[PDB]
Paper text:
Bunyamwera virus (BUNV) is the prototypic orthobunyavirus that serves as a tractable model for the Bunyavirales order. Each segment is encapsidated by multiple copies of the nucleocapsid protein (NP) to form a ribonucleoprotein (RNP), which associates with the virus-encoded RNA-dependent RNA polymerase (RdRp; L). RNPs serve as the active templates for all viral RNA synthesis activities and represent the form in which the RNA segments are packaged into virions.
Based on a cryo-EM average at 13 Å resolution and subsequent fitting of NP crystal structures by molecular dynamics, we were able to generate a pseudo-atomic model of the NP portion of the RNP. Given the absence of long, straight NP sections amenable to helical reconstruction, ~135,000 short NP sections were selected and processed using a single particle approach. The NP structure was symmetrized, and molecular dynamics were applied to restrain the ‘split’ NP. This allowed freedom of movement of the linker region of each terminal arm, which had already been shown to be flexible while minimizing alterations to the globular core of the protein or the binding regions of the arms. Displaying the surface coulombic potential of the helical model confirms that the positively charged RNA-binding groove of each monomer is aligned in a way that maintains an RNA-binding channel along with the interior of the entire helical filament. Furthermore, these rungs were too far apart (approximately 18 Å) to permit intermolecular interactions of any kind between NP monomers along the longitudinal axis. However, by comparing these NP-NP contacts with those within the native helical NP, 7 novel residues were identified between laterally adjacent NP monomers with sidechains potentially involved in weak H-bond or salt bridge interactions within the RNP helix.
Numbering used by the authors:
A (entry chain B), B (entry chain A), C (entry chain C): 1 to 228
The structure:
């Protein structure tokens, strides 16, 4: 006689990481060659990179984002999700966030013409679809990237505010905002900032609800001609 | 000289049972400890329970649906299908139906807040995939379970109506509706209710074609925060 | 270890054709049965033909524009765009342009009463929406058709002028005027006519900005009665 037991559904993936420390490791190791051409490549083909990782079976995959090259923990393969990725890991998710943190810093530590190189080249699919483009503010724009949610202190609650903005107009499910609520704003953890800095997340939501900008590029005689 | 004979294909499994009486036996024996946590466990892992029974070779298997425990005639093993399971038997199929009858009664004999405990906990994979969730009506929702087809009087032709709804949009094969046509609506048998209560099955089909609802759950500070 | 590369966005479809020669081929092969009833049919249902081609998966589709029948390279299906269509090809786009060239010639080589048969029957959706109708000049009217842009010598820069007129009041994106800049005015290529014949495109823009006319048709006793 065989007896065999069955149970309840998951609680989704929680923070099984230190985000500020994982962003450190990324920043230290990877951003050494990394440039705006390589970064835009990651965002643009963000669609395809997510698919191609979910295609492949291997646990350690490299992305060749132009010449720049990153090692990514593939958690996107079916089999591979629910195998804990280290405290220092990169995933598609974390990596996207990490590039977005890298940039939100960049956008607030670099020259206004260097920032225009950022603003032309980097194209954010999630941001662009919901209107938002660079002009609306860098901090707003960058938080549409997934993985931004790990760190809410930098962006000042715009990842959560966006999260909240998608759910209340029925676009994203409540449950992915469980992962967000299990992240830090500064060094404060889940429950504390939840009410302490409620009014932050309110103003941040108010802001990101409206905003929109748009841009175009490419050819050279055509560019010039057309302008007049 | 050896002579040896060959023949035609089956007629599929027919009612080799009394369904109202098999549901009695279930109800009497099993629903004595059985609770909404145990029930949801059966539905949720309905996917895995079907697989795990089809894996195992043994003819009598027990399911440990939380603490609650049921003895199931395994007919799901390859070898084991086409060995008649008694008139009082439980199979995966019958059992699922039997839990769904148990509930359709429950949903119409229990308090509206107790019904909300049902409506949160029990998640029906077959119902959820084709949209349907509790709000659309209990009787509709429960008939997506297989084994519901044994008893058409309780649900009022929704098992057959669903059956019919899957076949006409090419999702299920005609032949599983041969088993359904060999079941009872009330105490009437196959042929009689087929035309007598044709207009029942029509209105029932009309109903179950549209319907959809959805729900989400889990965390506690996150729940509260998110709500506003 | 799998390594896999990602890159930058397209440059849009460029002239992968000879337009004057593709219009030749069209003119030779197709305009042999083609009549004003068939032509108007193409324009009128220009809306639906674009949709129906983008619906279908097949690479060679025929349009049955009344009795008249044309073979069109379907580049409008999702899958099918970015598969080069020959130097002699017809696409929805090219074809529309080609009918518009056919006509702009017709409108300047046919009798003024035959031109009135053209002017009643052919209805140009893109032209009509932005006011323009036949009276404003044939050359103006016909250039609203897409595919007109391939040949700028015939119309005398009205396709580009219109293009420019849509972009500067925010109606069309800059990038479709990259395709236009990669076409010929007479036999001159992109860069040369860009500045050489700048003042052509200026006067042409000045013209097409204002213009509007309108018409009505159908019934017979009603027509007559109403007139008085």
């Amino acid at each position: 006689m065989i007896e065999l037991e069955f149970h309840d559904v998951a609680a989704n993936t929680s923070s099984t990481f230190d985000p500020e420390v994982a962003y450190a490791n990324f920043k230290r190791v990877h951003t050494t060659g990394l440039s705006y051409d390589h970064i835009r490549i990651f965002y643009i083909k963000g669609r395809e990179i997510k698919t191609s990782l979910a295609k492949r079976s291997e646990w350690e995959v490299t992305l060749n984002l132009g010449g720049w090259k990153i090692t990514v923990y593939n958690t996107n393969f079916p089999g591979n999700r629910n195998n804990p990725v280290p405290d220092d890991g990169l995933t598609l998710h974390r990596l996207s966030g990490f590039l977005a943190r890298y940039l939100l810093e960049k956008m607030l530590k670099v020259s206004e013409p260097e920032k225009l190189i950022i603003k032309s080249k980097i194209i954010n699919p999630l941001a662009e679809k919901n209107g938002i483009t660079w002009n609306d503010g860098e901090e707003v724009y960058l938080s549409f990237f997934p993985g931004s949610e790990m760190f809410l202190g930098t962006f000042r609650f715009y990842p959560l505010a966006i999260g909240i903005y998608k759910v209340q107009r029925k676009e994203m499910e409540p449950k992915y905002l469980e992962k967000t609520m299990r992240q830090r704003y500064m060094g404060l953890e889940a429950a504390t900032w939840t009410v302490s800095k409620l009014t932050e997340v309110q103003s941040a939501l108010t802001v990101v609800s409206s905003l929109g900008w748009k841009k175009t590029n490419v050819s050279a005689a055509a560019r010039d001609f057309l302008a007049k």
